[PDB]
Amino acid sequence: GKKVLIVYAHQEPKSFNGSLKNVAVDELSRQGCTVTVSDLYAMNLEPRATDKDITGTLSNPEVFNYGVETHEAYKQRSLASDITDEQKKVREADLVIFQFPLYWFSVPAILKGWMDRVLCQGFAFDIPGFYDSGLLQGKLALLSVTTGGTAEMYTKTGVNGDSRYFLWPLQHGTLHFCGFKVLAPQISFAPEIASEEERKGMVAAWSQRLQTIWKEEPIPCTAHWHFG
Amino acid sequence: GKKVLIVYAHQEPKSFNGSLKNVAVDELSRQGCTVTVSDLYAMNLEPRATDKDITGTPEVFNYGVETHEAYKQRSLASDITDEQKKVREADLVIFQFPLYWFSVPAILKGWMDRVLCQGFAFDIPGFYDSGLLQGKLALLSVTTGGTAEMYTKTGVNGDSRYFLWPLQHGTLHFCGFKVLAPQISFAPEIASEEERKGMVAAWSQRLQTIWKEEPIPCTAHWHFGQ
Ligand SMILES: Cc1cc2nc3c(=O)[nH]c(=O)nc-3n(C[C@H](O)[C@H](O)[C@H](O)COP(=O)(O)OP(=O)(O)OC[C@H]3O[C@@H](n4cnc5c(N)ncnc54)[C@H](O)[C@@H]3O)c2cc1C
Ligand SMILES: Cc1cc2nc3c(=O)[nH]c(=O)nc-3n(C[C@H](O)[C@H](O)[C@H](O)COP(=O)(O)OP(=O)(O)OC[C@H]3O[C@@H](n4cnc5c(N)ncnc54)[C@H](O)[C@@H]3O)c2cc1C
Ligand SMILES: CC(C)Cn1cnc2c(N)nc3ccccc3c21
Ligand SMILES: CC(C)Cn1cnc2c(N)nc3ccccc3c21
């Protein structure tokens, strides 16, 4: 009995992203997994890191330090309920899948907000407690990303660089930092440009992958993996 | 007479980020430059990319498609159109922010997602050196929790150039900006009072001659070469 959280960042449910989210729900549900989806746009998730994230009185009201205050709030159990509700879902999940379109070589801001606000000190990492000793150690994470650019554009010799280069802040700087074991990324290249049958192939490939997701070895999340 | 836009993403004005923002306003103001600051948190800037960003003039909503067409029909939300005006006027755009998860805080990511729309910041074709903001300069002034030693090839975080790539190349260069070398103020929370004043003074001092700098070559070799 494995539990999966899908953190989904797309405005349109009929989108290619929406279709990949639905494939994941359908296939993981079919296997018997416990499935939860955080539909960020539908939730209107707050993305901004503010003092509204701590309920009640701050440790230092005169000089606001987001990091210090959220860490203390986590320990005193006074974080905002949107945050705590996402932390419960992550705590319980064996696998967290992130489903998003690539925005500026990164995640859409609503998803960046999830990362900034949910993955607080005391919950996702601590001193000590980062990289392999991160507080979410043992859990799996997978980035399922769609792009505007084609696969041939995302090469070492192409204008955009290797797709692996943009993965570094997400996979290493965020997910590994918090102790996640990172499964290989699912990159669905250029669905808007691809033919209908290429798009169906990409959907079929993700469906197929999901069938054996629990047998996968994670990647070695190193500078060498990302940059060669 | 040079025009500078500072896009500033910090909650507290007494922070180390607030201090670096203030030093930039003070020094550039002293020089006689025109200075505008977009204080994103104080503005409560909308970060989310939604259909509310198109203000007038379908079945399946594609943010990229609709915002591009909206930009051409002069029908983007006023927060966007106001930021675009500031960018259009600016000779230099300084981004002042603490590093959050090897990137910009979400509020600033929202500024990038929403302000730099197709037709305004780039076209296809019309990116990288053909980007629409060609002739302008951008500079990332970034603070970290991690120490400088941590941000090396043999440190736990890897080379700082590795996190700069999506921002400097993938975003700024893509829109046609020429990128001045980043100002990275490592670990002010950990530094002594003296070391901190040093880092503030180093930014102030660099700004005195910022108009004589040449931008970096925003290439893969620059970011990954060694
Ligand atoms: C602010 C911003 C920044 C961006 N930055 C970048 C960047 O840095 N790099 C980059 O490469 N790209 C970038 N993009 C482009 C973006 O990554 C793509 O537009 C996005 O990945 C497309 O995915 P989608 O789900 O929106 O596609 P959609 O437009 O929803 O889908 C494409 C097609 O697939 C169809 N479809 C849906 N479901 C199925 C199905 N089951 N079977 C077959 N077909 C189906 C849809 O009907 C549609 O015709 C950016 C876009 C924006 C708005
Ligand atoms: C969600 C989140 C994600 C993060 N992710 C990362 C990451 O991926 N990598 C990373 O390295 N770090 C990360 N951090 C840490 C973050 O980058 C640092 O906390 C931030 O950069 C420090 O800058 P600050 O302005 O907030 O420092 P402050 O705490 O404001 O400054 C430190 C000290 O300097 C003092 N000060 C202010 N002005 C002056 C002056 N003129 N002279 C002398 N002293 C002064 C202040 O009073 C304070 O005591 C993250 C933090 C958060 C909350
Ligand atoms: C919105 C899509 C129809 C295309 N698109 C939109 N924004 C962007 C962007 N920053 N980089 C790109 C790089 C290659 C191909 C497409 C895009 C792109
Ligand atoms: C006046 C105060 C309430 C804030 N403040 C304090 N010192 C300074 C300073 N050198 N430059 C600034 C530049 C812009 C805005 C505020 C300040 C500032």
Ligand SMILES: CC(C)Cn1cnc2c(N)nc3ccccc3c21
């Ligand atoms: C230490 C120098 C920079 C002078 N200075 C001292 N305090 C201040 C201040 N609050 N605002 C300013 C605004 C513009 C230029 C200089 C200053 C300034």
Ligand SMILES: CC(C)Cn1cnc2c(N)nc3ccccc3c21
């Ligand atoms: C080890 C800390 C002293 C600083 N640090 C170094 N790398 C990172 C990182 N990815 N996220 C953070 C989030 C909050 C606070 C510090 C960090 C951080």
Ligand SMILES: [Zn+2]
């Ligand atoms: Zn790693």
Ligand SMILES: [Zn+2]
């Ligand atoms: Zn570049």
